[PDB]
């Protein structure tokens, strides 16, 4: 999370029933959040606020410490959170997707998707796109949507493995898609062509990040705890990081314009 | 500068109607867009002017456009070296075990 009034990065990690914030310059603790009755399941940050979800209700944290807004109305656990301007998108386990206005706490729009046909496993809002969110499924299909018009723009047939990760590439119209088979597909959503494909034989791709300091380097996580560095320019593997963590990789990110 | 340099040397599959229609959106009174103005006349610009402003802010933040944006063992992950059937030379792999006469200790040769 980048901050206003302080030209620094902050990284927020969940700790049981609370969360901790550290500055990336020296990994020093700056704030410890208030407790919530149940264990936090999903977390999101949008610069100004930190969003945490527990059970079927999720709340917003201000000043990284104390809650100021709570949002009820879901009958299943929240599995994805996407901040969208002044609005927040929450996706439930049963298949309900609802957009909430943060400050007024009113219910803007609600959508449902059939669990057997289309179960949401990844959510992404591509940059420079007006009111557009891309949704992936365990089945393997992708749907592009417009929140404001509430219509289906396009449906991507995709691949039969199923989507497990979505990431915005350092380009206007390019995304990186992770699959359960260990294959990462870098795709252009506007004209529907696949730029390149990379395959890791370590299980599903947990997370993907891009290096933006002038070197075309890509990293993809694996549940074994290994990290593979792929060369985007020459379509090859640079090197592999073995046992970066003893357990499964939770999330990996390149800092902006940094090595 | 340019003179000195010389001497030395489809269609999108989908369309969104609200992006087509020419409505105008206020950069003023919106915190995220107030930081994005250029001149004072751009208090409220239309859809097409929003699109090019957003894209160039993205590219300047990214530092430009990457070059990649416009049989073999290093397009997969795997090993290269394996163990040989014959005994390797140089280094012997050994682990000490319990003494053979551990149960019956003796002091003679």
């Amino acid at each position: 999370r980048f901050s206003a009034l302080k030209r620094r990065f902050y990284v927020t990690t969940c700790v049981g029933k609370s969360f901790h914030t550290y500055d990336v310059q020296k990994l020093s603790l700056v704030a410890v959040s208030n407790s919530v009755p149940q264990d936090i399941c999903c977390m999101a940050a949008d610069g100004r606020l930190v969003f945490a979800a527990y059970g079927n209700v999720f709340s917003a944290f201000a000043r990284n410490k104390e809650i100021v807004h709570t949002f009820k109305g879901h009958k299943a656990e929240i599995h994805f959170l996407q901040p969208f301007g002044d609005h927040i998108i929450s996706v439930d386990t049963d298949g309900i997707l609802i957009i909430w206005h943060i400050y007024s706490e009113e219910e803007y729009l609600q959508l449902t998707f059939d669990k057997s046909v289309f179960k949401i496993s990844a959510i992404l809002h591509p940059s420079t796109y007006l009111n557009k969110i891309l949704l992936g499924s365990e089945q393997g299909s992708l749907q592009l949507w417009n929140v404001k018009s509430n219509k289906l723009l396009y449906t991507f047939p995709g691949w039969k493995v199923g989507v497990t990760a979505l990431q915005q590439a350092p380009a206007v119209d390019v995304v990186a898609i992770g699959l359960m088979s260990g294959q990462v597909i870098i795709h252009n959503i506007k004209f529907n062509e696949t730029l390149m494909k990379f395959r890791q034989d370590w299980g599903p791709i947990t997370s993907i990040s891009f290096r933006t300091d002038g070197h075309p380097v890509m990293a993809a996580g694996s549940p074994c705890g290994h990290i593979g560095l792929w060369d985007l320019e020459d379509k090859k593997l640079i090197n592999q990081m073995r046992n970066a963590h003893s357990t499964a990789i939770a999330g990996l990110t390149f800092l902006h314009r940094e090595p | 500068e340019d003179a000195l340099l010389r001497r030395l040397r489809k269609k999108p599959v989908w369309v969104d109607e609200e992006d087509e229609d020419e409505e105008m959106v206020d950069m003023m009174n919106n915190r995220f867009r107030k930081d994005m103005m250029k001149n004072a006349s751009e208090s409220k610009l239309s859809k097409d002017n929003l699109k090019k402003r957003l894209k160039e802010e993205f590219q300047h933040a990214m530092g430009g456009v990457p070059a990649w944006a416009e049989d073999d063992l290093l397009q997969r992950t795997g090993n290269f070296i394996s163990t040989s059937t014959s005994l390797p030379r140089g280094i012997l792999k050994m682990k000490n075990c319990q003494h053979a006469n551990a149960e019956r200790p003796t002091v003679a040769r």
């Binding site: 609005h87 206005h101 007024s104 009113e106 803007y108 009111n131 929140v147 404001k148 | 959106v25």
Partner: peptide
């Protein structure tokens, strides 16, 4: 984002 605040 450009969604309206309420309704």
């Amino acid at each position: 984002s450009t969604l309206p605040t309420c309704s």
